[PDB]
Amino acid sequence: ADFIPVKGKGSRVWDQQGKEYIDFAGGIAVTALGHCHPALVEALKSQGETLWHTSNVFTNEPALRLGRKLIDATFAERVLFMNSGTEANETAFKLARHYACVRHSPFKTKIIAFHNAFHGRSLFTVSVGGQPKYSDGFGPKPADIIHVPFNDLHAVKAVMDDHTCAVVVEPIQGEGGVQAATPEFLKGLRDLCDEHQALLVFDEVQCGMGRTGDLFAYMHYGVTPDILTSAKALGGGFPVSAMLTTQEIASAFGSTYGGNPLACAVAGATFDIINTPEVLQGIHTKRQQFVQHLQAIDEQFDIFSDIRGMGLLIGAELKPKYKGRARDFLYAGAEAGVMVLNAGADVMRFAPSLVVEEADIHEGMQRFAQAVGKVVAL
Amino acid sequence: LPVKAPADFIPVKGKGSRVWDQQGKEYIDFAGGIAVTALGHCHPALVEALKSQGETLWHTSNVFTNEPALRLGRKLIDATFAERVLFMNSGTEANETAFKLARHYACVRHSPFKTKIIAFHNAFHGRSLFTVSVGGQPKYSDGFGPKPADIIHVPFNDLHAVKAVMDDHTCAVVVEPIQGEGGVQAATPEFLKGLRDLCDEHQALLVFDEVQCGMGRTGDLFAYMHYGVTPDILTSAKALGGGFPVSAMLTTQEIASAFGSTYGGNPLACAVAGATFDIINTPEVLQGIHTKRQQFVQHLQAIDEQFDIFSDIRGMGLLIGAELKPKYKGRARDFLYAGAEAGVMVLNAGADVMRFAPSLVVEEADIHEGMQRFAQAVGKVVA
Numbered sequence: 001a002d003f004i005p006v007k008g009k010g011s012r013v014w015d016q017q018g019k020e021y022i023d024f025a026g027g028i029a030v031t032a033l034g035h036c037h038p039a040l041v042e043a044l045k046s047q048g049e050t051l052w053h054t055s056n057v058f059t060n061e062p063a064l065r066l067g068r069k070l071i072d073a074t075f076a077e078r079v080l081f082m083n084s085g086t087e088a089n090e091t092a093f094k095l096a097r098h099y100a101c102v103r104h105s106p107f108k109t110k111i112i113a114f115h116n117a118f119h120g121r122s123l124f125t126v127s128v129g130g131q132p133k134y135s136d137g138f139g140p141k142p143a144d145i146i147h148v149p150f151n152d153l154h155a156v157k158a159v160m161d162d163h164t165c166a167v168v169v170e171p172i173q174g175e176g177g178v179q180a181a182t183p184e185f186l187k188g189l190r191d192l193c194d195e196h197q198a199l200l201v202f203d204e205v206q207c208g209m210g211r212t213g214d215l216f217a218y219m220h221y222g223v224t225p226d227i228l229t230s231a232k233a234l235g236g237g238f239p240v241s242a243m244l245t246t247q248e249i250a251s252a253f254g255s256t257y258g259g260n261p262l263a264c265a266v267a268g269a270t271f272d273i274i275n276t277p278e279v280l281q282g283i284h285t286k287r288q289q290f291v292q293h294l295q296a297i298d299e300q301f302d303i304f305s306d307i308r309g310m311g312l313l314i315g316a317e318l319k320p321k322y323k324g325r326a327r328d329f330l331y332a333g334a335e336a337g338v339m340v341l342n343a344g345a346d347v348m349r350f351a352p353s354l355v356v357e358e359a360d361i362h363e364g365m366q367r368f369a370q371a372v373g374k375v376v377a378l
Numbered sequence: 379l380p381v382k383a384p385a386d387f388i389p390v391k392g393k394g395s396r397v398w399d400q401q402g403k404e405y406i407d408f409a410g411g412i413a414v415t416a417l418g419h420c421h422p423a424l425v426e427a428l429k430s431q432g433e434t435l436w437h438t439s440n441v442f443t444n445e446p447a448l449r450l451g452r453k454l455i456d457a458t459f460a461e462r463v464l465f466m467n468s469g470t471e472a473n474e475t476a477f478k479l480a481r482h483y484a485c486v487r488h489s490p491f492k493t494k495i496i497a498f499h500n501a502f503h504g505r506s507l508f509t510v511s512v513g514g515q516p517k518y519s520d521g522f523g524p525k526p527a528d529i530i531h532v533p534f535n536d537l538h539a540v541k542a543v544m545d546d547h548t549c550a551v552v553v554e555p556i557q558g559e560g561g562v563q564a565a566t567p568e569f570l571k572g573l574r575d576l577c578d579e580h581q582a583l584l585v586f587d588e589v590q591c592g593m594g595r596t597g598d599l600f601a602y603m604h605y606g607v608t609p610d611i612l613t614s615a616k617a618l619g620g621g622f623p624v625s626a627m628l629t630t631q632e633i634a635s636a637f638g639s640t641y642g643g644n645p646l647a648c649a650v651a652g653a654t655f656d657i658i659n660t661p662e663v664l665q666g667i668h669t670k671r672q673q674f675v676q677h678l679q680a681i682d683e684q685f686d687i688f689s690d691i692r693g694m695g696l697l698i699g700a701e702l703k704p705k706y707k708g709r710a711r712d713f714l715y716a717g718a719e720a721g722v723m724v725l726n727a728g729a730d731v732m733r734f735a736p737s738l739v740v741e742e743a744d745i746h747e748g749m750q751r752f753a754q755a756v757g758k759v760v761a
């Protein structure tokens with residue numbers, strides 16, 4: 001990036017020179033309520049005057065309240081809080097392994113994961129991730145992880161057995177080209193996990209906390225996982241994460257564990273806004289506003305082969321002529337004053353605030369059209 | 379057995395080195411949330427930094443830098459051997475980055491086969507699968523399926539053992555200059571210098587985990603400065619953010635080039651850490667840490683004179699360990715819980731060792747009051 005953001009309000013961001021940008025990136029789907037949302041600032045300041053920190057020896061009122069919100073709203077009966085999606089995934093993957101070890105057999109260790117998956121950058125999580133380029137070169141990887149293609153239920157059936165402890169999947173692969181699970185695939189994972197006494201682990205770090213227009217993507221699909229991870233949007237920009245599971249599974253390790261008081265106070269305020277009928281409905285309204293602009297851009301410039309994703313996770317795949325050039329459009333966008341994402345070198349990605357104003361959708365998309373125009377003019 | 383608070387002990391408010399629970403019971407905090415709140419609770423400078431940056435910008439992705447991250451990177455670079463800084467959230471993440479970097483540096487500069495990591499019994503480096511496997515407590519790394527391989531453990535402070543296992547296939551030695559969880563055991567000068575010399579000989583990287591002993595804890599900004607032994611990579615967290623989760627991996631340009639001068643860092647986190655750094659890295663605060671250590675130690679000695687409970691008082695700066703006599707082997711949790719009943723929050727470092735990690739600016743009045751409360755608790759335990 002060739003600029004330094006210094007200030008943000010809602011979906012507008014200013015750099016050191018006072019240039020104004022429309023933010024359709026959200027810090028990679030993190031600032032789900034935009035920058036410096038008044039309710040989140042209020043929660044930060046109030047808890048900031050009270051108590052910031054407890055060790056995991058203790059609980060605290062913000063953690064208890066956030067845990068109760070998540071438990072009441074989801075399949076979860078137990079919640080463990082951490083800082084990042086990577087830590088939440090470490091916890092989920094360790095827990096699925098440990099549960100298999102103590103409830104079934106120490107030899108029940110296979111983890112099935114998917115090509116193009118992203119689960120974090122720790123050694124274990126990057127090894128469960130499905131991009132060999134990112135996991136190569138750090139010495140011996142944690143073993144017993146098998147990768148098959150996303151959306152290939154037959155391949156999962158083929159590799160799964162009584163020695164399998166988990167299937168780990170992103171219901172929508174965000175980094176991996178914004179690819180959504182098909183209904184049959186996701187239901188199939190649930191059935192195969194039931195058959196083999198393995199745990200189904202949904203990584204909802206990117207697609208959770210309202211991103212799809214349901215509180216969690218699993219709710220859209222109607223497929224209940226055993227363990228779910230959440231981060232990013234959960235804290236609206238404050239680092240916080242959660243691992244959600246049942247009492248039966250968590251017992252392999254009170255309804256909550258961990259949680260920074262400050263982080264959890266902010267996440268509570270974020271949860272209270274995102275988990276409302278009006279905000280969730282609005283995510284679908286706004287998706288259509290974005291998609292209509294992307295279609296208009298494609299009609300004018302002929303650059304997209306597909307527009308996909310769910311809610312306000314949007315992917316627009318570039319036509320073969322522009323394969324490999326997502327970064328060129330990202331940089332042209334920045335020049336035109338709009339912040340966008342890629343999802344690999346072939347895919348444009350958008351992950352704006354879930355409450356992005358219509359006026360900002362229109363302005364940012366006009367700027368993006370200008371960017372596309374400048375690139376295609378060459 | 380872990381230490382866990384019961385349902386009737388939920389902290390709700392902190393100010394300085396005092397904490398109140400839901401019932402309004404007041405505690406003196408000599409634990410700092412396990413050496414995290416190095417400037418105590420709701421320190422006004424940290425609150426101000428939190429609030430001002432909180433009105434401005436909280437978050438950038440790692441695609442961008444931000445002014446708080448740049449300022450904090452510069453402060454750390456100017457104050458230490460570092461030329462490059464990577465910011466993360468937790469000590470576990472910083473250690474993941476450090477260990478991956480040492481592995482990757484060896485892979486690309488020497489050989490993909492140069493993978494051995496040497497670490498120490500009783501080490502604690504975090505709870506991710508890789509960090510807990512580098513950690514030196516098998517009980518905590520057992521039971522998660524196949525561990526990342528090529529990690530060798532030898533006894534802390536045993537230089538012969540390190541020499542024995544190291545070779546040209548070794549990429550790193552990972553060490554806490556003081557093992558905090560492992561009984562508050564400090565490296566001897568010979569041992570730490572020996573690690574540096576062995577790493578130089580074998581072209582391996584010396585990695586200091588200063589998550590607990592760094593950011594002023596020892597009375598120097600980092601423990602490596604006390605020892606005068608410069609690592610290749612250093613990790614910091616806990617005190618760095620004073621209660622806000624933030625961490626850092628510090629290294630040189632030569633090493634980092636295997637992966638400007640700063641990468642990552644949450645704007646809000648880095649604003650708070652900048653304010654924390656500005657206070658801790660002062661001659662007066664650093665001197666005060668030594669004064670305050672001796673105030674604690676004199677109290678512990680007075681307790682021992684009265685009750686005969688300790689075989690050793692150790693640590694550095696305001697990381698203090700007090701080892702229980704054999705008569706009280708395995709009683710550390712009981713003294714901790716008795717302390718809480720008496721209104722003082724303390725730590726353990728294994729079942730045989732009391733640990734103290736108070737605010738680096740803990741007021742003398744709080745030292746005296748909390749230690750009087752601790753004496754009362756001891757009296758109840760040994761009656």
Ligand SMILES: Cc1ncc(COP(=O)(O)O)c(/C=N/OCC[C@H](N)C(=O)O)c1O
Pocket residue numbers: 028083084085086087089118119120121170174175203204205206207231232440
């Ligand atoms: C599905 C999914 N699972 C886990 C993670 C890791 O979460 P994090 O540690 O909170 O960044 C992520 C994080 N994505 O972050 C953006 C890419 C990333 N910035 C990187 O390469 O580190 C994710 O998308």
Ligand SMILES: Cc1ncc(COP(=O)(O)O)c(/C=N/OCC[C@H](N)C(=O)O)c1O
Pocket residue numbers: 055056057412467468469470471473502503504505554558559587588589590591615616
């Ligand atoms: C030398 C050393 N290295 C790494 C870490 C991990 O740092 P963290 O991820 O910031 O907690 C620590 C953290 N210790 O904290 C205590 C334990 C904590 N509740 C846990 O079990 O993770 C440490 O002392």
Ligand SMILES: O=[N+]([O-])c1cc([N+](=O)[O-])c(O)c([N+](=O)[O-])c1
Pocket residue numbers: 379380381382383
């Ligand atoms: O080791 N343990 O199984 C264990 C269990 C509980 N508990 O509430 O059921 C504790 O509070 C603690 N504890 O106090 O650390 C330990």
Ligand code: NA
Pocket residue numbers: 070071072073074075076077
């Ligand atoms: Na529930």
Ligand code: NA
Pocket residue numbers: 454455456457458459460461
């Ligand atoms: Na330097």
